[PDB]
Design an enzyme around this catalytic site. Structure first.
Site, short mmCIF file in Angstrom:
data_model
loop_
_atom_site.label_atom_id
_atom_site.label_comp_id
_atom_site.label_asym_id
_atom_site.label_seq_id
_atom_site.Cartn_x
_atom_site.Cartn_y
_atom_site.Cartn_z
N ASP A 69 0.85 -1.19 0.00
CA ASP A 69 0.00 0.00 0.00
C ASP A 69 0.89 1.25 0.00
O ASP A 69 1.96 1.25 -0.63
CB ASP A 69 -0.92 -0.07 1.24
CG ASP A 69 -2.20 0.73 1.10
OD1 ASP A 69 -2.12 1.97 0.95
OD2 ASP A 69 -3.31 0.14 1.18
N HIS A 100 -3.22 6.56 3.73
CA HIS A 100 -3.99 5.48 3.14
C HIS A 100 -3.57 4.14 3.72
O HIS A 100 -4.37 3.46 4.36
CB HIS A 100 -3.85 5.49 1.63
CG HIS A 100 -4.78 4.54 0.93
ND1 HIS A 100 -4.43 3.23 0.67
CD2 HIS A 100 -6.04 4.69 0.48
CE1 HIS A 100 -5.43 2.63 0.06
NE2 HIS A 100 -6.43 3.49 -0.07
N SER A 311 -9.67 -0.85 -1.82
CA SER A 311 -8.51 -1.32 -1.07
C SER A 311 -8.89 -1.57 0.39
O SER A 311 -8.34 -2.44 1.05
CB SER A 311 -7.35 -0.33 -1.17
OG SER A 311 -7.73 0.92 -0.66
#
EC number: 3.4.21.-
Length: 380
Positions: A69, A100, A311
Site C-alpha cells: 500500500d 492510506h 482497497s
C-alpha cells in the site's frame, strides 16, 4: 481478451526500490475526521460483518499479513513492521505520506481500545508494511516514447508490484493485501509477465493468500460493461472487457474484492470485471490514523471526504483470511479463498462482475462445514 497466462519462470529478483526514480509532487497528507462523528459506536462495517461474533472463533494470532500500500505510520494499535519501500530508493515502508496504508493496515489488524468502538478484523495479526504506491511521490523522468505501453507509469507500478509480492512472500507473509489496481485499455497491453510470475511464486511456492482491490473508477480507470446476455459461452463477459485491472484479473489465483456501501449494494466506484471474486464494506468507513486514533476522513477542498475504496474492502477480506488461517491452519491458499467465497452472501445468478461470489460473511466462513475443495487453483 482471454484470462492471463502465467510464465512461471519470469519471477523477478527480490529487490526493493521503485521501477524508476521518483520525486515529490504533493505535501504529505494526514487523515482527519468528519464533523459530528461518534467513535464510541461500532463502525457500521463491524456490525454488518459481525466482527465481534467472528472474533469468538479467531483473532489472527500467529498469522502475518503483508500490506502492500502507501506505507504505514505505525503506533501501538497499528503495530506494523518494516517490509520495504518500492517508491523511494531509501525507505522501509514505515512512512505513510498518503494517508492510506495506515488505515488499510488498521482495518486488517488494528487493536481495540477502552476509549472507542474501533477494532480491526484480525487484531492479533503481525503486520508487515511494504510501500508500493504513492500519489505524493511519483516517477520524475519523462517517457522517451509515448507509444510504448511498457514505459507508462502503470507498467512501472506493475513491475514494482511484482517485486514487492516476491519480497512479501519471502518475508514470510501468509496473507498479502494488495491495494494497487493498475488499469489499462485492452487495446494497449502491458507486459505483466513478471507480475503473473511473482503471484504464482507467492501463492504456489510460498503458500500465501493474496487478496486484491477490484479497483476504483476515476481518471485512467473506466468502468467495464456488463456481460452480454445473448452470449452464453461468455457469461462473465470476458469478450466485453474494455479495461484490464491488474492484479485483479489473476483471479482465482488471487481473491479480487469489490466494494459495497451501507445499503449492501455495490459501490458505484467499484470496478467491475469477469475476475471479481468477492465484496466487502468500502464506503463511509472508520479506521485508525497515525497515532492509532480513530479517523474517518481525509482532507478535501470542499470539506473532509469519507474513507472509501476497494482497497479497504480488500483489507476486510485480508483480515478474514487471517482469521480463517488461524482457525484452519492446514488449508492451502486456494482452500482458504474457497471457504471465504463459498460462505459469502451470494448475489442473484450466484456470481456477478460487481461483487463476485458476494459479500463476505466472517462468521459463516469460520463455522460452516464445507468440502475443502482442491489444494491449488486452476491457472493458465
Amino acid at each position: 481478451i482471454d484470462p492471463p497466462v502465467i510464465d512461471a519462470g519470469a519471477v523477478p529478483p527480490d529487490e526493493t526500490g521503485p521501477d524508476q526514480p521518483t520525486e515529490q509532487r504533493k505535501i504529505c497528507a494526514t487523515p482527519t475526521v468528519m464533523p459530528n462523528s461518534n467513535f464510541a459506536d461500532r463502525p457500521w462495517a463491524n456490525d454488518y460483518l459481525r466482527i465481534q461474533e467472528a472474533q469468538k472463533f479467531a483473532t489472527g494470532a500467529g498469522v502475518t499479513v503483508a500490506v502492500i500500500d502507501t506505507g504505514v505510520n505505525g503506533s501501538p494499535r497499528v503495530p506494523a513492521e518494516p517490509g520495504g519501500d518500492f517508491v523511494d530508493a531509501a525507505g522501509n515502508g514505515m512512512s505513510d505520506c498518503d494517508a492510506h496504508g495506515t488505515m488499510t493496515a488498521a482495518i486488517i489488524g488494528g487493536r481495540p481500545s477502552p476509549t472507542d468502538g474501533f477494532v480491526g478484523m484480525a487484531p492479533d495479526v503481525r503486520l508487515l508494511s511494504l510501500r508500493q504506491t504513492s500519489v505524493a511521490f511519483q516517477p520524475k523522468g519523462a517517457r522517451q516514447d509515448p507509444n510504448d505501453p511498457n514505459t507508462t507509469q502503470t507498467a512501472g507500478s506493475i513491475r514494482s508490484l511484482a517485486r514487492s509480492v516476491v519480497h512479501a512472500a519471502n518475508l514470510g507473509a501468509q496473507v498479502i493485501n494488495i491495494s494497487e489496481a493498475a488499469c489499462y485499455k485492452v487495446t494497449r497491453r502491458i507486459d505483466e509477465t513478471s507480475l503473473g510470475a511473482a503471484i504464482n511464486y507467492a501463492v504456489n511456492v510460498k503458500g500465501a493468500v493474496i487478496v486484491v482491490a477490484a479497483g476504483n473508477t476515476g481518471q485512467d480507470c473506466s468502468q467495464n460493461p456488463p456481460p452480454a446476455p445473448s452470449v452464453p459461452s461468455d457469461p462473465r463477459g470476458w469478450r466485453e472487457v474494455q479495461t484490464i485491472v491488474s492484479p485483479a484479473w489473476y483471479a482465482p489465483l488471487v481473491l479480487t474484492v469489490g466494494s459495497i456501501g451501507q445499503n449492501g449494494q455495490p459501490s458505484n466506484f467499484s470496478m467491475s470485471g469477469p475476475w471479481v471474486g468477492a465484496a466487502a464494506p468500502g464506503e463511509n468507513l472508520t479506521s485508525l490514523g497515525y497515532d492509532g486514533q480513530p479517523v474517518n476522513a481525509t482532507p478535501g477542498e470542499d470539506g473532509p471526504v469519507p474513507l472509501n475504496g476497494t482497497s479497504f474492502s480488500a483489507a476486510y477480506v485480508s483480515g478474514l483470511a487471517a482469521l480463517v488461517k488461524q482457525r484452519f491452519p492446514d488449508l492451502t491458499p486456494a482452500q482458504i479463498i474457497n471457504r471465504i467465497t463459498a460462505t459469502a452472501r451470494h448475489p442473484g445468478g450466484g456470481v456477478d462482475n460487481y461483487v463476485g461470489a458476494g459479500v463476505i460473511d466472517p462468521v459463516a466462513a469460520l463455522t460452516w462445514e464445507i468440502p475443502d475443495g482442491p489444494e491449488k487453483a486452476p491457472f493458465r
